[PDB]
Symmetry: D2
Subunit: 115 residues, 4 copies
Protein backbone atom coordinates (compact mmCIF):
# COMPACT_ATOMS: atom_id res chain seq x y z
CA UNK A 1 0.00 0.00 0.00
CA UNK A 2 3.02 2.37 0.20
CA UNK A 3 5.91 2.31 -2.27
CA UNK A 4 8.71 4.83 -2.75
CA UNK A 5 10.62 5.26 -5.99
CA UNK A 6 13.67 7.53 -6.39
CA UNK A 7 15.48 8.56 -9.60
CA UNK A 8 18.74 10.47 -10.22
CA UNK A 9 18.50 13.36 -12.67
CA UNK A 10 22.29 13.73 -12.99
CA UNK A 11 23.12 10.10 -13.89
CA UNK A 12 19.83 9.23 -15.54
CA UNK A 13 19.44 6.21 -13.35
CA UNK A 14 17.57 4.83 -10.44
CA UNK A 15 18.79 6.27 -7.15
CA UNK A 16 20.02 3.09 -5.43
CA UNK A 17 20.54 2.54 -1.72
CA UNK A 18 18.65 5.68 -0.72
CA UNK A 19 17.49 5.56 2.91
CA UNK A 20 13.82 6.39 3.47
CA UNK A 21 12.06 6.94 6.80
CA UNK A 22 8.31 7.13 7.24
CA UNK A 23 6.72 8.78 10.22
CA UNK A 24 3.11 9.07 11.37
CA UNK A 25 1.78 12.00 13.37
CA UNK A 26 0.78 10.89 16.88
CA UNK A 27 -1.99 12.10 19.09
CA UNK A 28 0.40 14.47 20.84
CA UNK A 29 1.41 15.96 17.52
CA UNK A 30 4.87 14.39 17.40
CA UNK A 31 6.22 12.30 14.56
CA UNK A 32 6.16 8.59 15.48
CA UNK A 33 8.48 6.25 13.53
CA UNK A 34 6.36 4.13 11.24
CA UNK A 35 8.61 2.30 8.79
CA UNK A 36 11.91 2.63 7.01
CA UNK A 37 14.04 1.01 4.33
CA UNK A 38 16.44 1.42 1.40
CA UNK A 39 15.76 1.71 -2.31
CA UNK A 40 16.83 -1.27 -4.37
CA UNK A 41 18.80 -1.46 -7.60
CA UNK A 42 15.61 -0.39 -9.42
CA UNK A 43 15.29 2.70 -7.23
CA UNK A 44 12.20 1.17 -5.61
CA UNK A 45 11.39 0.53 -1.97
CA UNK A 46 8.78 -2.13 -1.43
CA UNK A 47 7.49 -3.75 1.71
CA UNK A 48 7.44 -0.74 4.02
CA UNK A 49 4.01 -1.59 5.48
CA UNK A 50 0.87 -3.69 5.36
CA UNK A 51 -2.79 -2.79 4.79
CA UNK A 52 -3.35 -3.56 8.48
CA UNK A 53 -0.67 -1.35 9.79
CA UNK A 54 -1.22 1.48 7.35
CA UNK A 55 -4.15 3.13 8.99
CA UNK A 56 -5.52 6.63 8.44
CA UNK A 57 -3.20 9.40 9.50
CA UNK A 58 -0.80 12.11 8.54
CA UNK A 59 2.40 10.58 7.19
CA UNK A 60 5.79 12.03 6.48
CA UNK A 61 8.10 10.28 4.00
CA UNK A 62 11.68 11.49 4.53
CA UNK A 63 14.09 10.64 1.72
CA UNK A 64 17.70 10.98 2.77
CA UNK A 65 18.95 12.75 -0.26
CA UNK A 66 22.01 14.29 1.48
CA UNK A 67 23.42 10.87 2.41
CA UNK A 68 22.80 9.69 -1.18
CA UNK A 69 24.72 12.59 -2.75
CA UNK A 70 27.55 12.47 -0.21
CA UNK A 71 28.04 8.75 -0.94
CA UNK A 72 28.57 9.71 -4.63
CA UNK A 73 31.07 12.35 -3.54
CA UNK A 74 28.82 15.35 -4.10
CA UNK A 75 27.93 18.15 -1.65
CA UNK A 76 24.21 18.76 -2.09
CA UNK A 77 21.93 21.57 -0.98
CA UNK A 78 19.07 19.82 0.82
CA UNK A 79 19.20 17.74 3.97
CA UNK A 80 16.37 15.49 2.80
CA UNK A 81 13.26 15.52 0.67
CA UNK A 82 10.01 15.36 2.59
CA UNK A 83 6.56 14.40 1.56
CA UNK A 84 3.77 15.04 4.08
CA UNK A 85 0.22 13.89 3.39
CA UNK A 86 -3.00 12.49 4.87
CA UNK A 87 -3.49 8.83 3.90
CA UNK A 88 -6.47 6.51 3.88
CA UNK A 89 -9.00 8.94 5.13
CA UNK A 90 -11.70 7.73 2.73
CA UNK A 91 -10.60 4.16 3.06
CA UNK A 92 -7.52 2.19 2.00
CA UNK A 93 -5.57 3.44 -0.97
CA UNK A 94 -2.27 2.49 -2.57
CA UNK A 95 0.33 5.22 -2.66
CA UNK A 96 3.47 5.55 -4.71
CA UNK A 97 5.70 8.42 -3.74
CA UNK A 98 8.20 9.14 -6.54
CA UNK A 99 11.10 11.57 -6.24
CA UNK A 100 13.58 12.87 -8.83
CA UNK A 101 16.86 14.18 -7.42
CA UNK A 102 19.44 16.73 -8.41
CA UNK A 103 22.11 18.28 -6.16
CA UNK A 104 20.24 21.59 -5.74
CA UNK A 105 16.68 20.47 -6.56
CA UNK A 106 14.14 17.76 -6.21
CA UNK A 107 10.68 16.98 -7.29
CA UNK A 108 8.10 14.62 -6.00
CA UNK A 109 4.76 13.27 -7.12
CA UNK A 110 2.15 10.88 -5.72
CA UNK A 111 0.30 8.15 -7.60
CA UNK A 112 -2.76 7.15 -5.60
CA UNK A 113 -4.93 4.23 -6.65
CA UNK A 114 -8.01 2.60 -5.21
CA UNK A 115 -7.68 -1.14 -5.21
Amino acid sequence: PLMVKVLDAVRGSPAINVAVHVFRKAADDTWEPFASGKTSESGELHGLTTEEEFVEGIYKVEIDTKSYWKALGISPFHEHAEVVFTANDSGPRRYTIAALLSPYSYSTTAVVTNP
Copy 2:
Protein backbone atom coordinates in the same frame (compact mmCIF):
# COMPACT_ATOMS: atom_id res chain seq x y z
CA PRO B 1 14.64 -0.77 -25.39
CA LEU B 2 12.36 2.33 -25.33
CA MET B 3 9.53 2.81 -22.84
CA VAL B 4 7.49 5.93 -22.09
CA LYS B 5 5.72 6.54 -18.80
CA VAL B 6 3.38 9.49 -18.15
CA LEU B 7 1.88 10.66 -14.84
CA ASP B 8 -0.77 13.30 -13.99
CA ALA B 9 0.20 15.78 -11.29
CA VAL B 10 -3.36 17.11 -10.88
CA ARG B 11 -5.14 13.77 -10.32
CA GLY B 12 -2.22 11.90 -8.80
CA SER B 13 -2.62 9.11 -11.27
CA PRO B 14 -1.14 7.55 -14.33
CA ALA B 15 -1.90 9.57 -17.45
CA ILE B 16 -3.90 7.01 -19.44
CA ASN B 17 -4.51 6.97 -23.18
CA VAL B 18 -1.84 9.58 -23.91
CA ALA B 19 -0.70 9.49 -27.55
CA VAL B 20 3.06 9.36 -28.07
CA HIS B 21 4.95 9.74 -31.36
CA VAL B 22 8.62 8.96 -31.82
CA PHE B 23 10.63 10.40 -34.66
CA ARG B 24 14.20 9.82 -35.82
CA LYS B 25 16.29 12.47 -37.55
CA ALA B 26 17.00 11.47 -41.16
CA ALA B 27 20.02 12.10 -43.29
CA ASP B 28 18.37 15.18 -44.78
CA ASP B 29 17.75 16.56 -41.31
CA THR B 30 13.99 15.96 -41.30
CA TRP B 31 12.10 14.05 -38.65
CA GLU B 32 11.18 10.56 -39.92
CA PRO B 33 8.31 8.76 -38.16
CA PHE B 34 9.75 5.94 -36.12
CA ALA B 35 7.06 4.56 -33.81
CA SER B 36 3.95 5.58 -31.97
CA GLY B 37 1.42 4.34 -29.43
CA LYS B 38 -0.81 5.10 -26.45
CA THR B 39 -0.13 4.85 -22.74
CA SER B 40 -1.98 2.08 -20.95
CA GLU B 41 -3.97 2.12 -17.72
CA SER B 42 -0.64 2.12 -15.86
CA GLY B 43 0.53 5.21 -17.75
CA GLU B 44 3.12 3.08 -19.54
CA LEU B 45 3.77 2.58 -23.23
CA HIS B 46 5.59 -0.61 -24.06
CA GLY B 47 6.44 -2.21 -27.36
CA LEU B 48 7.32 0.88 -29.37
CA THR B 49 10.41 -0.71 -30.94
CA THR B 50 12.89 -3.58 -31.06
CA GLU B 51 16.64 -3.74 -30.46
CA GLU B 52 17.03 -4.28 -34.21
CA GLU B 53 15.05 -1.33 -35.28
CA PHE B 54 16.30 1.01 -32.58
CA VAL B 55 19.59 1.97 -34.10
CA GLU B 56 21.83 4.92 -33.24
CA GLY B 57 20.35 8.29 -34.00
CA ILE B 58 18.74 11.44 -32.76
CA TYR B 59 15.23 10.69 -31.53
CA LYS B 60 12.34 12.92 -30.64
CA VAL B 61 9.62 11.63 -28.30
CA GLU B 62 6.50 13.79 -28.67
CA ILE B 63 3.91 13.35 -25.93
CA ASP B 64 0.53 14.74 -26.89
CA THR B 65 -0.24 16.48 -23.70
CA LYS B 66 -2.75 18.94 -25.25
CA SER B 67 -5.01 16.12 -26.47
CA TYR B 68 -4.77 14.48 -23.01
CA TRP B 69 -5.87 17.63 -21.15
CA LYS B 70 -8.60 18.51 -23.66
CA ALA B 71 -10.08 15.00 -23.28
CA LEU B 72 -10.37 15.72 -19.51
CA GLY B 73 -12.06 19.01 -20.31
CA ILE B 74 -9.10 21.24 -19.50
CA SER B 75 -7.47 23.93 -21.69
CA PRO B 76 -3.73 23.47 -21.24
CA PHE B 77 -0.77 25.67 -22.11
CA HIS B 78 1.54 23.40 -24.11
CA GLU B 79 0.91 21.73 -27.43
CA HIS B 80 3.01 18.71 -26.51
CA ALA B 81 6.00 17.71 -24.44
CA GLU B 82 9.11 16.87 -26.40
CA VAL B 83 12.17 14.94 -25.51
CA VAL B 84 15.06 15.05 -27.99
CA PHE B 85 18.17 12.93 -27.46
CA THR B 86 20.91 10.87 -29.11
CA ALA B 87 20.40 7.14 -28.49
CA ASN B 88 22.65 4.11 -28.72
CA ASP B 89 25.76 5.89 -29.77
CA SER B 90 28.01 3.79 -27.53
CA GLY B 91 26.00 0.68 -28.18
CA PRO B 92 22.50 -0.49 -27.27
CA ARG B 93 20.91 0.95 -24.17
CA ARG B 94 17.45 0.77 -22.63
CA TYR B 95 15.67 4.07 -22.25
CA THR B 96 12.71 5.03 -20.14
CA ILE B 97 11.34 8.47 -20.81
CA ALA B 98 9.08 9.56 -17.92
CA ALA B 99 6.94 12.70 -17.95
CA LEU B 100 4.86 14.36 -15.22
CA LEU B 101 2.07 16.63 -16.46
CA SER B 102 0.25 19.66 -15.20
CA PRO B 103 -1.89 22.07 -17.26
CA TYR B 104 0.80 24.79 -17.39
CA SER B 105 3.93 22.69 -16.73
CA TYR B 106 5.66 19.45 -17.36
CA SER B 107 8.77 17.67 -16.40
CA THR B 108 10.65 14.85 -17.94
CA THR B 109 13.49 12.55 -17.00
CA ALA B 110 15.39 9.70 -18.65
CA VAL B 111 16.42 6.41 -17.06
CA VAL B 112 19.13 4.83 -19.18
CA THR B 113 20.42 1.35 -18.44
CA ASN B 114 22.98 -0.90 -20.07
CA PRO B 115 21.66 -4.40 -20.42
Copy 3:
Protein backbone atom coordinates in the same frame (compact mmCIF):
# COMPACT_ATOMS: atom_id res chain seq x y z
CA PRO C 1 19.80 36.87 2.00
CA LEU C 2 16.72 34.59 1.84
CA MET C 3 13.83 34.88 -0.59
CA VAL C 4 11.07 32.39 -1.37
CA LYS C 5 9.21 32.26 -4.68
CA VAL C 6 6.17 30.10 -5.29
CA LEU C 7 4.51 29.28 -8.63
CA ASP C 8 1.28 27.48 -9.58
CA ALA C 9 1.57 24.83 -12.30
CA VAL C 10 -2.23 24.46 -12.69
CA ARG C 11 -3.08 28.08 -13.34
CA GLY C 12 0.24 29.13 -14.82
CA SER C 13 0.64 31.98 -12.38
CA PRO C 14 2.50 33.11 -9.30
CA ALA C 15 1.05 31.46 -6.16
CA ILE C 16 -0.27 34.49 -4.35
CA ASN C 17 -0.98 34.85 -0.64
CA VAL C 18 0.66 31.57 0.28
CA ALA C 19 1.80 31.28 3.94
CA VAL C 20 5.47 30.45 4.37
CA HIS C 21 7.21 29.60 7.64
CA VAL C 22 10.96 29.34 8.12
CA PHE C 23 12.41 27.43 11.04
CA ARG C 24 15.99 27.01 12.25
CA LYS C 25 17.21 23.78 13.77
CA ALA C 26 18.05 24.15 17.43
CA ALA C 27 20.69 22.41 19.52
CA ASP C 28 18.12 19.90 20.80
CA ASP C 29 17.17 19.10 17.24
CA THR C 30 13.87 20.91 17.58
CA TRP C 31 12.62 23.37 14.98
CA GLU C 32 12.47 26.96 16.23
CA PRO C 33 10.52 29.68 14.46
CA PHE C 34 12.79 31.97 12.52
CA ALA C 35 10.76 34.08 9.98
CA SER C 36 7.47 33.93 8.12
CA GLY C 37 5.18 35.77 5.73
CA LYS C 38 2.83 35.49 2.77
CA THR C 39 3.78 35.56 -0.89
CA SER C 40 3.03 38.73 -2.82
CA GLU C 41 1.22 39.20 -6.12
CA SER C 42 4.45 38.13 -7.85
CA GLY C 43 4.64 34.89 -5.81
CA GLU C 44 7.65 36.24 -3.93
CA LEU C 45 8.34 36.69 -0.26
CA HIS C 46 10.99 39.21 0.51
CA GLY C 47 12.29 40.60 3.76
CA LEU C 48 12.31 37.38 5.78
CA THR C 49 15.66 38.02 7.40
CA THR C 50 18.81 40.13 7.44
CA GLU C 51 22.43 39.33 6.85
CA GLU C 52 22.99 39.66 10.61
CA GLU C 53 20.30 37.21 11.64
CA PHE C 54 20.88 34.58 8.98
CA VAL C 55 23.74 32.44 10.21
CA GLU C 56 24.96 29.07 9.03
CA GLY C 57 22.79 26.15 10.09
CA ILE C 58 19.94 23.94 9.02
CA TYR C 59 16.71 25.66 8.00
CA LYS C 60 13.28 24.41 7.10
CA VAL C 61 10.95 26.36 4.80
CA GLU C 62 7.35 25.14 5.14
CA ILE C 63 4.92 26.31 2.47
CA ASP C 64 1.23 25.95 3.31
CA THR C 65 0.17 24.50 0.03
CA LYS C 66 -2.93 22.82 1.41
CA SER C 67 -4.55 26.19 2.33
CA TYR C 68 -3.52 27.61 -0.99
CA TRP C 69 -5.25 24.89 -3.02
CA LYS C 70 -8.33 24.93 -0.73
CA ALA C 71 -8.75 28.64 -1.26
CA LEU C 72 -8.84 27.98 -5.05
CA GLY C 73 -11.31 25.12 -4.68
CA ILE C 74 -8.82 22.46 -5.74
CA SER C 75 -8.34 19.21 -3.94
CA PRO C 76 -4.74 18.82 -2.68
CA PHE C 77 -2.56 15.89 -1.66
CA HIS C 78 0.08 17.31 0.62
CA GLU C 79 -0.32 18.90 4.02
CA HIS C 80 2.44 21.31 3.17
CA ALA C 81 5.66 21.44 1.24
CA GLU C 82 8.92 21.40 3.04
CA VAL C 83 12.35 22.44 2.01
CA VAL C 84 15.18 21.57 4.47
CA PHE C 85 18.67 22.80 3.74
CA THR C 86 21.97 23.92 5.18
CA ALA C 87 23.10 27.50 4.85
CA ASN C 88 26.85 27.44 4.14
CA ASP C 89 28.99 30.58 4.29
CA SER C 90 31.60 29.15 1.83
CA GLY C 91 29.01 29.25 -0.93
CA PRO C 92 27.30 32.34 -2.30
CA ARG C 93 25.51 34.79 -0.13
CA ARG C 94 21.95 35.06 -1.42
CA TYR C 95 19.50 32.17 -1.36
CA THR C 96 16.30 31.93 -3.38
CA ILE C 97 14.11 28.94 -2.57
CA ALA C 98 11.71 28.41 -5.50
CA ALA C 99 8.78 26.01 -5.47
CA LEU C 100 6.44 24.94 -8.25
CA LEU C 101 3.14 23.58 -7.03
CA SER C 102 0.62 21.07 -8.38
CA PRO C 103 -2.11 19.33 -6.46
CA TYR C 104 -0.30 15.96 -6.19
CA SER C 105 3.28 17.13 -6.84
CA TYR C 106 5.77 19.82 -6.16
CA SER C 107 9.23 20.74 -7.29
CA THR C 108 11.80 22.92 -5.58
CA THR C 109 15.17 24.35 -6.49
CA ALA C 110 17.74 26.65 -4.93
CA VAL C 111 19.22 29.63 -6.73
CA VAL C 112 22.30 30.63 -4.71
CA THR C 113 24.15 33.71 -5.96
CA ASN C 114 26.44 36.56 -4.97
Copy 4:
Protein backbone atom coordinates in the same frame (compact mmCIF):
# COMPACT_ATOMS: atom_id res chain seq x y z
CA PRO D 1 5.40 40.06 -23.66
CA LEU D 2 7.75 37.04 -23.76
CA MET D 3 10.58 36.31 -21.35
CA VAL D 4 12.58 33.12 -20.85
CA LYS D 5 14.28 32.19 -17.59
CA VAL D 6 16.64 29.25 -17.22
CA LEU D 7 17.98 27.71 -13.99
CA ASP D 8 20.60 25.03 -13.25
CA ALA D 9 19.58 22.31 -10.79
CA VAL D 10 23.13 20.91 -10.49
CA ARG D 11 24.92 24.09 -9.51
CA GLY D 12 21.98 25.85 -7.90
CA SER D 13 22.37 28.92 -10.05
CA PRO D 14 20.92 30.78 -12.99
CA ALA D 15 21.92 29.11 -16.29
CA ILE D 16 24.03 31.84 -17.83
CA ASN D 17 24.85 32.34 -21.49
CA VAL D 18 22.41 29.72 -22.70
CA ALA D 19 21.28 30.09 -26.36
CA VAL D 20 17.53 30.31 -26.81
CA HIS D 21 15.67 30.27 -30.12
CA VAL D 22 11.99 31.06 -30.58
CA PHE D 23 10.11 29.88 -33.65
CA ARG D 24 6.57 30.55 -34.85
CA LYS D 25 4.55 27.92 -36.65
CA ALA D 26 3.89 28.84 -40.25
CA ALA D 27 0.91 28.07 -42.46
CA ASP D 28 2.74 25.10 -44.00
CA ASP D 29 3.39 23.75 -40.54
CA THR D 30 7.06 24.63 -40.75
CA TRP D 31 8.89 26.41 -37.95
CA GLU D 32 10.00 29.94 -38.85
CA PRO D 33 12.58 31.86 -36.86
CA PHE D 34 10.99 34.48 -34.69
CA ALA D 35 13.47 35.73 -31.98
CA SER D 36 16.57 34.53 -30.19
CA GLY D 37 19.24 35.46 -27.67
CA LYS D 38 21.39 34.29 -24.78
CA THR D 39 20.45 34.26 -21.12
CA SER D 40 21.99 36.92 -18.90
CA GLU D 41 23.82 36.58 -15.60
CA SER D 42 20.40 36.25 -13.94
CA GLY D 43 19.38 33.39 -16.27
CA GLU D 44 16.87 35.66 -17.98
CA LEU D 45 16.36 36.62 -21.58
CA HIS D 46 14.49 39.82 -22.08
CA GLY D 47 13.65 41.81 -25.17
CA LEU D 48 12.80 38.91 -27.47
CA THR D 49 9.76 40.57 -28.99
CA THR D 50 7.28 43.44 -28.79
CA GLU D 51 3.58 43.58 -28.23
CA GLU D 52 3.17 44.40 -31.93
CA GLU D 53 5.13 41.42 -33.22
CA PHE D 54 3.84 38.80 -30.81
CA VAL D 55 0.52 37.63 -32.21
CA GLU D 56 -1.57 34.61 -31.34
CA GLY D 57 -0.23 31.34 -32.69
CA ILE D 58 1.91 28.36 -31.86
CA TYR D 59 5.46 29.05 -30.73
CA LYS D 60 8.43 26.85 -30.00
CA VAL D 61 11.16 27.88 -27.55
CA GLU D 62 14.32 25.79 -28.05
CA ILE D 63 16.93 26.01 -25.31
CA ASP D 64 20.40 24.76 -26.23
CA THR D 65 20.99 22.78 -23.12
CA LYS D 66 23.56 20.48 -24.69
CA SER D 67 26.02 23.36 -25.31
CA TYR D 68 25.37 24.69 -21.85
CA TRP D 69 26.29 21.43 -20.11
CA LYS D 70 29.30 20.86 -22.43
CA ALA D 71 30.68 24.26 -21.55
CA LEU D 72 30.55 23.24 -17.85
CA GLY D 73 32.16 19.88 -18.52
CA ILE D 74 29.05 17.88 -17.69
CA SER D 75 27.74 15.07 -19.77
CA PRO D 76 24.18 15.77 -21.02
CA PHE D 77 21.31 13.64 -22.28
CA HIS D 78 19.17 15.92 -24.38
CA GLU D 79 20.03 17.65 -27.62
CA HIS D 80 18.00 20.62 -26.51
CA ALA D 81 14.91 21.42 -24.54
CA GLU D 82 11.77 22.42 -26.30
CA VAL D 83 8.74 24.23 -25.13
CA VAL D 84 5.81 24.39 -27.62
CA PHE D 85 2.76 26.43 -26.73
CA THR D 86 -0.10 28.51 -28.02
CA ALA D 87 -0.25 32.21 -27.34
CA ASN D 88 -3.88 33.09 -26.59
CA ASP D 89 -5.11 36.68 -26.42
CA SER D 90 -8.03 35.78 -24.08
CA GLY D 91 -5.55 34.92 -21.35
CA PRO D 92 -3.10 37.30 -19.71
CA ARG D 93 -0.69 39.39 -21.67
CA ARG D 94 2.79 38.57 -20.40
CA TYR D 95 4.39 35.16 -20.76
CA THR D 96 7.38 33.88 -18.82
CA ILE D 97 8.70 30.50 -19.94
CA ALA D 98 10.84 29.08 -17.10
CA ALA D 99 13.03 26.00 -17.40
CA LEU D 100 14.96 24.10 -14.75
CA LEU D 101 17.80 22.02 -16.14
CA SER D 102 19.54 18.82 -15.06
CA PRO D 103 21.73 16.60 -17.17
CA TYR D 104 19.09 13.88 -17.73
CA SER D 105 15.95 15.89 -16.93
CA TYR D 106 14.27 19.20 -17.33
CA SER D 107 11.16 20.90 -16.07
CA THR D 108 9.30 23.83 -17.53
CA THR D 109 6.42 26.02 -16.45
CA ALA D 110 4.57 29.06 -17.76
CA VAL D 111 3.91 32.14 -15.66
CA VAL D 112 1.24 34.11 -17.54
CA THR D 113 0.26 37.44 -15.99
CA ASN D 114 -1.18 40.87 -16.67
